[PDB]
Amino acid sequence: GKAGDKEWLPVTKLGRLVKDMKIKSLEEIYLFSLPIKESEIIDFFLGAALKDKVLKIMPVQKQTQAGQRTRFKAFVAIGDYNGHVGLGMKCSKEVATAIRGAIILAKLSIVPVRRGYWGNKIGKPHTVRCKVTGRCGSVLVRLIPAPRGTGIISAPVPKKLLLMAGIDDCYTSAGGCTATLGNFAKATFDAISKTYSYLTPDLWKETVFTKSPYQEFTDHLVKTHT
C-alpha cells in the first residue's frame, strides 16, 4: 500500500520508546500497567493486523430551547484474534466520526485476555483458565470454559467480541436485560478482562519482576525538547 504515512509525533514517553523500537509488545505496558493515552501506541504495537467491527449505530436525542436534537452512537470492538481486544462506544454528529472515534476509543481500552485449557492442556490454550463474570448496569455475562469443538456459545454480538478476543471455545450464560446491547457487550468485556485478575495456583509464585522500560529508557524518553 501507498498513501503517505502520517507523522505521528508522540506526546508521551511511553510512545517514544515504542516508536524507537524500545518498546516492542503491549505486554510491557500491561505488566507495568502503564496507562495509554496516545492511540498510535496501540496502533504501532498491535492493531497492525488488528480488525475493528462496528457493533451498532442506534441514534438517540435531547431537547433544545427551540425544540429538538438528534445524533449517531456507534459501538465498536477491536481485537486481533489472539489475546487482545478493546471496546468503544461513541456518539457524534456524523456516522463516520462516530465510527472513527469509536475505533480510537476501542484501541485505548485494549485488554489482555488470559486463555486457558478446559483441562487437558495439549496444543495450546483453547478456552479459559477459569470462569469469569462481568456486570454492567443489570446485565451480567458469565464465561465458562468448555471442551474443544464447543466453540463460542453466546449471542451473536457477544460471540463477535469473544471471537476477536481469540477465544475458541467457551460457554456463556447471560442474565439481566440482554436487549440493551451496549450493556451486554460491556459486561462481557469486563468478563474477559477479569481473566487476568484471576489468581490461579500457577501464578502463586513471585519475582524480581521488572524495572520498567520507562526507567531504563528514561533518557530515551526525555528527547531533546521540552
Binding site: 506526546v11 514517553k13 496507562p35 493515552k37 526507567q215 528514561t218
Partner: protein
Amino acid sequence: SGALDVLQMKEEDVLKFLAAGTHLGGTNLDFQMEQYIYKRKSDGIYIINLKRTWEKLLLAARAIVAIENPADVSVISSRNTGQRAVLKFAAATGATPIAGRFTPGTFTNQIQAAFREPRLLVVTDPRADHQPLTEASYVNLPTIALCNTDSPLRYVDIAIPCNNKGAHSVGLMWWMLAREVLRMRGTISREHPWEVMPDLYFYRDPEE
C-alpha cells in the same frame, strides 16, 4: 540504624526539629496515623515521634535519590507555608515544581501546558493538595507526603509526620529532605551539617 551508623539520629537535628516545633501534633489523631504518635500532652495535643518522623524522612530522601532524572521528581504545594519551601527544594535537587493552583488535568491530559509525567510526587498537605494526590492515582505515580496526625492517607505511600499547622515545621522538613537527598546520591559528602541556613525555606508574606 540499618544503613549502618552515622545515619542514625544526631542531637543536632533533634534540636532543629524540636526548635521548629515539628513533633507538636494534631488533637484529632485519625486512625491510620496512630503509629506515629508518641504520647498525648495534657490539655489536648499529641507529641509526634520525632525519631519516627526522622527515619521516614530519610526513607523519603532515599526514594528521591534512585529516581534518575532528578528534574522529574515533583515537589508540590498550594499551601503558602510551603511555597518558597518547595521552590527552594527544586533549586537544590533537580526537582521540577508545582505551586499554587495545581491545575487539573496536569497528569492525565497530554494536551495541557502544565502536563507533567513525574516518577515521584512529594506533597505538603494531602488535604489542600488533594487534586494532585488524586491525579497521581490516575497514572501510577508514587507519593511522599507531609502529614500531620489528621491527614488523608489515601493514595500516599510514605508519610513524614510534621505539624503542618505550620511555622517552620513545614520549612524544616523540606529543608532536611533536600539536605538529605543532596547527601545521598548527590554530593554533600560527610553526613556532616549545612552551609545553607534552614530559614531560606520558610514562608514570606505580607507588607504593611
